[PDB]
Design an enzyme around this catalytic site. Structure first.
Site, mmCIF file in Angstrom:
data_model
loop_
_atom_site.group_PDB
_atom_site.id
_atom_site.type_symbol
_atom_site.label_atom_id
_atom_site.label_comp_id
_atom_site.label_asym_id
_atom_site.label_seq_id
_atom_site.Cartn_x
_atom_site.Cartn_y
_atom_site.Cartn_z
ATOM 1 N N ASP A 15 40.602 26.157 -13.110
ATOM 2 C CA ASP A 15 41.324 25.239 -12.330
ATOM 3 C C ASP A 15 41.401 25.301 -10.900
ATOM 4 O OD1 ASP A 15 43.274 23.591 -12.288
ATOM 5 O OD2 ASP A 15 44.904 24.591 -12.422
ATOM 6 N N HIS A 20 44.584 14.601 -9.711
ATOM 7 C CA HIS A 20 44.903 14.856 -11.016
ATOM 8 C C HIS A 20 44.867 13.749 -11.886
ATOM 9 C CE1 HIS A 20 47.137 18.314 -8.871
ATOM 10 N NE2 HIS A 20 46.630 18.979 -9.562
#
Ligand SMILES: CC(C)(C)CNC(=O)Cc1ccc(Nc2nc(-c3ccccc3)ncc2C(N)=O)cc1
Ligand SMILES: [Ca+2]
Ligand SMILES: [Zn+2]
Length: 345
Positions: A239, A81
């Site tokens: 995503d 991330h």
């Protein structure tokens, strides 16, 4: 230049960016040539190619100052991330927005919000899940009452930075565009909360059930409610897109994300958290967990996305299966999926 990028690999970056409009772009090389400014470099690329800078009078300098700032608010030390992931989601969103079923549908403003929501959706991600934050009673969990904790953070941070010096990329939108964009961005980022996946998909199945296209094959969305449901699913798909890429890239994502999950297990141990110990690199099966995820979450999502945009997504979907079959072949505390599903309560 402004990215400081070397005259050395400027041809490289230019040649890699030729596939900017393609699903098989390699965001990893792009980061190499940008000196680890993939998010900024790709966003700038995206905005030129769609001419968003000109349309919304967002000067180059404003865009780059903002994007640089935003990219700095992602932690390069968090394994998965970081800005590379953000960069990949924006580029993946850029591709989805232009499939034939979809391309004529969205307004410039809507296109702007989707790509922006993509860029910011993980900014300032600490490396840990919502639940970890809740269980540690972090300030964030308390600030957002334990609901969409990080997703509420990513939005706040993404909009906050607009106020730094020459960072307001939405300065030349009308008051009405700024609130339309804002409602949409909010919707799309909160949509990325995985505890919302099932209700996301349920609604998408419905969009499909009653989808109608124009003579041109363009999907018809006549109310704000419909096109924001497609948008939010679009960004959730993006995503959730890792496993739909060429196997070699999916392998690199999986290494990163597993590193990050197991590093969350180390933090849970260090802190003597709860009691329930997550399986580690030795006792866990990464192969099982992938196939569990693809069957439980990814494929059900992409299959539905493929119906909505038939047949735009077929090469994407055929790769997913292939990839699932390949993790399949490699298959020989509390495991990856046991943990993800339990804490969906
Ligand atoms: C619940 C948790 C796993 C501890 C932390 N996770 C979160 O905070 C939310 C979250 C963030 C990213 C992803 N993406 C992915 N999640 C998995 C996965 C597989 C088995 C069990 C659980 C997850 N696999 C691949 C990706 C992929 N390559 O995209 C899924 C969930
Ligand atoms: Ca997220
Ligand atoms: Zn993400």
């Amino acid at each position: 230049s402004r990215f400081g990028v070397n005259t050395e690999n400027e041809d490289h970056l230019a040649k890699e960016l030729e596939d900017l409009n393609k699903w098989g772009l390699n965001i990893f090389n792009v980061a190499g040539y940008s000196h680890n400014r993939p998010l900024t470099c790709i966003m700038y690329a995206i905005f030129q190619e769609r001419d968003l800078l000109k349309t919304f009078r967002i000067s180059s300098d404003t865009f780059i100052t903002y994007m640089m700032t935003l990219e700095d608010h992602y932690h390069s030390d968090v394994a998965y991330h970081n800005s590379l992931h953000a960069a990949d989601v924006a580029q993946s969103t850029h591709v989805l927005l232009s499939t034939p079923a979809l391309d004529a549908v969205f307004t410039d403003l809507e296109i702007l919000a989707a790509i922006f929501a993509a860029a910011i959706h993980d900014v300032d991600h600490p490396g840990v899940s919502n639940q970890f934050l809740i269980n540690t009673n972090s300030e964030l969990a308390l600030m957002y009452n334990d609901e969409s904790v990080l997703e509420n953070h990513h939005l706040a941070v993404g909009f906050k930075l607009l106020q730094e010096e020459h960072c307001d990329i939405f300065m030349n939108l009308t008051k009405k565009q700024r609130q339309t964009l804002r409602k949409m961005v909010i919707d799309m980022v909160l949509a990325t909360d995985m505890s919302k996946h099932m209700s996301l998909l349920a609604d998408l199945k419905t969009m499909v059930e009653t989808k109608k296209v124009t003579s041109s094959g363009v999907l018809l969305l006549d109310n704000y409610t419909d096109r924001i449901q497609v948008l939010r699913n679009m960004v959730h798909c993006a995503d959730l897109s890792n496993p739909t890429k060429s196997l070699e890239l999916y392998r690199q994502w999986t290494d990163r994300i597993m590193e990050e999950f197991f590093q969350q297990g180390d933090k849970e141990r260090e802190r003597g958290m709860e009691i329930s110990p997550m399986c580690d690199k030795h006792t866990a099966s990464v192969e099982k967990s992938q196939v569990g995820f693809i069957d439980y979450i990814v494929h059900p999502l992409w299959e539905t996305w493929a119906d909505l945009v038939q047949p735009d997504a077929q090469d994407i979907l055929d790769t997913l299966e292939d990839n699932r079959n390949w993790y399949q072949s490699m298959i020989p505390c509390q495991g990856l999926m046991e943990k993800f599903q339990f804490e969906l309560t």
